[PDB]
């Protein structure tokens with residue numbers, strides 16, 4: 022059931038901001054490995070003396086990579102005179118975040134109708150403020166509140182390309198890479214305790230709720246297009262607890278990137294795993310794919326089923342739809358954040374968000390496949 | 393003239409160690425953009441709880457990329473019990489280095505006959521010690537002394553693959569990339585004052601000395617295969633001063649990578665500039681290549697000359713030989729460290745090091761070409 026209890030009008034995921042130590046190298050690695058286009062920048066060449074920010078896009082997916090310059094470049098600046106394009110940025114916060122967690126997501130940004138209203142309502146319902154609403158170039162309003170750990174939920178609202186202060190990248194430097202990724206499906210956080218974390222986030226958004234490892238629940242917006250699952254560990258080793266130990270606390274676990282064609286996406290990504298791209302988790306045993314026809318035989322032809330076997334793609338099914346999924350290795354040095362590629366089948370109305378679930382059935386289907 | 397005044401037996405450049413925030417993403421970017429093979433690792437999967445280190449190799453060129461884990465992973469370790477494979481590593485030093493300078497070279501490593509003797513003699517002749525000699529697995533000895541800024545000169549000596557504690561990468565994860573790079577030619581540092589810096593480094597090594605921008609001199613070993621130029625700025629804007637401001641002091645400016653075939657190297661690197669690799673500085677004006685036949689007409693055929701024009705390759709000449717060179721854009725966010733590709737022609741005896749010089753003539757040949 023959908024109570025539709027959003028306390029402000031939420032639309033879609035807008036962007037994901039990574040806080041790194043060197044934004045150039047991460048952006049280039051991600052661009053090549055994921056097939057994302059280099060489309061906007063904010064740095065020294067655009068007059069930003071505070072931070073380097075490079076935007077990658079694939080369809081509607083927007084990845085932002087930000088790193089701090091030497092504070093000496095902007096020592097005489099104050100906040101009213103800053104040359105930073107993202108006003109919530111903070112040298113001390115960024116360096117502390119990066120040295121504490123390593124590479125990871127700082128901001129999950131969602132587009133809203135009015136960021137300042139979204140901030141006010143959120144704080145009045147228990148959200149811890151992080152950056153107050155600020156209007157950029159009389160065009161865009163941005164505000165941030167705490168989500169979990171050091172991750173903040175960012176509200177963006179437009180009066181009427183990314184943000185003021187960003188430059189469109191020249192076509193010569195912008196290679197039209199595309200492996201089929203089109204938008205962000207969901208963003209999942211790991212916390213030490215799911216109870217307080219759900220109560221906190223559901224408390225200020227009004228989002229409703231959608232033997233190995235974790236306990237989890239999924240918070241969703243009204244149209245169920247903004248999906249925010251959260252994991253806690255179970256003790257008795259949990260992948261969630263390993264994340265908390267290596268990340269130094271709560272944070273974002275994985276980003277799910279919907280592909281228009283997961284087969285092409287995975288062929289392009291796997292071709293590049295060993296030449297600068299991303300490695301994937303080991304494939305399921307062949308017993309797993311020898312049981313797929315037993316479950317998804319009416320959805321996937323056995324030509325397509327065996328194509329999932331070469332690519333290592335997982336299949337799960339739901340009340341209303343079918344899910345195709347695969348997980349990469351951790352994106353950086355630490356066994357923390359990783360990426361999942363998905364494509365959903367069913368629930369045609371547009372496609373309703375969350376069609377197929379999130380792969381809970383794949384835990385027992387893989388536990389039993391390895392026998 | 394060559395005084396051959398080395399105070400200990402120096403052989404060759406051994407490796408360059410980059411200190412980064414995330415060693416996975418930098419290594420992968422460098423691997424793809426430069427065509428270097430992923431050949432050794434030291435991290436969690438090999439029992440290293442202190443730091444992640446990934447070695448790239450192309451011919452004899454060895455690039456090492458190191459980042460610190462969370463100190464919590466090794467809080468109970470002391471130096472005699474450390475699981476770090478590089479014992480000179482220090483969480484506080486690495487994070488301070490990276491947050492102060494951004495991505496850059498921490499260690500220029502040269503192979504010597506006896507690292508502990510090299511350290512003792514160096515310190516007794518005025519070198520500031522950084523890490524005392526330590527014997528690894530009764531096989532390799534490592535020691536470090538300060539070079540300039542936070543860059544240390546590292547001595548490696550072998551009793552008889554990189555270091556103890558590193559694992560050979562499995563062939564499945566090791567793609568044989570190769571764009572023609574074969575060894576490190578020279579490593580150049582920028583300092584605020586060339587006088588004290590030369591006196592300091594020449595003082596403890598015994599190395600002998602080999603209107604726009606800089607003042608520089610080149611220190612060399614006996615066989616002149618280890619070459620260490622140093623730049624200072626001239627005021628009246630200097631690229632050297634810009635480096636010092638953005639790097640927060642002295643450091644390594646550029647690494648010169650000798651290619652067996654600079655034409656193929658540059659074609660492979662340029663093909664990849666916009667898909668995760670490295671950008672190059674803008675090419676000289678066509679007037680420059682319209683004057684190349686006037687100077688190098690006896691060395692390069694005009695088919696090869698015009699091939700330098702498409703690639704943007706610079707040509708300089710010496711008393712004894714000819715130099716081919718090109719410079720990349722800065723490797724990271726800050727306008728600091730960059731890379732130069734070179735191939736030397738002449739001085740056949742093996743080829744004697746430094747054949748062709750370092751491109752001093754290209755300053756006036758480019759100043760006059762732009763007219």
Ligand SMILES: Cc1cccc(C)c1-n1c(=O)c2cc(C(=O)C3=C(O)CCCC3=O)ccc2n(C)c1=O
Nearest residue numbers: 209234237250252260302348361379380381383384
């Ligand atoms: C990738 C990996 C590495 C080491 C250990 C493990 C358990 C895993 N791992 C997963 O992380 C994983 C995650 C999801 C997933 O996306 C998901 C959750 O199940 C929680 C609810 C929200 C959500 O979206 C589904 C299936 C998974 N499976 C099957 C899996 O094996």
Ligand SMILES: Cc1cccc(C)c1-n1c(=O)c2cc(C(=O)C3=C(O)CCCC3=O)ccc2n(C)c1=O
Nearest residue numbers: 580605608621623631673719732750751752754755
């Ligand atoms: C690449 C770039 C960017 C912005 C500003 C400038 C001056 C440059 N720049 C160089 O840095 C450069 C460096 C060398 C060089 O390698 C070298 C030196 O001349 C000092 C002695 C040791 C040594 O090896 C040669 C030619 C150069 N030229 C011609 C050039 O234009």
Ligand SMILES: [Co+2]
Nearest residue numbers: 209277361379
């Ligand atoms: Co998921």
Ligand SMILES: [Co+2]
Nearest residue numbers: 580648732750
């Ligand atoms: Co040089």
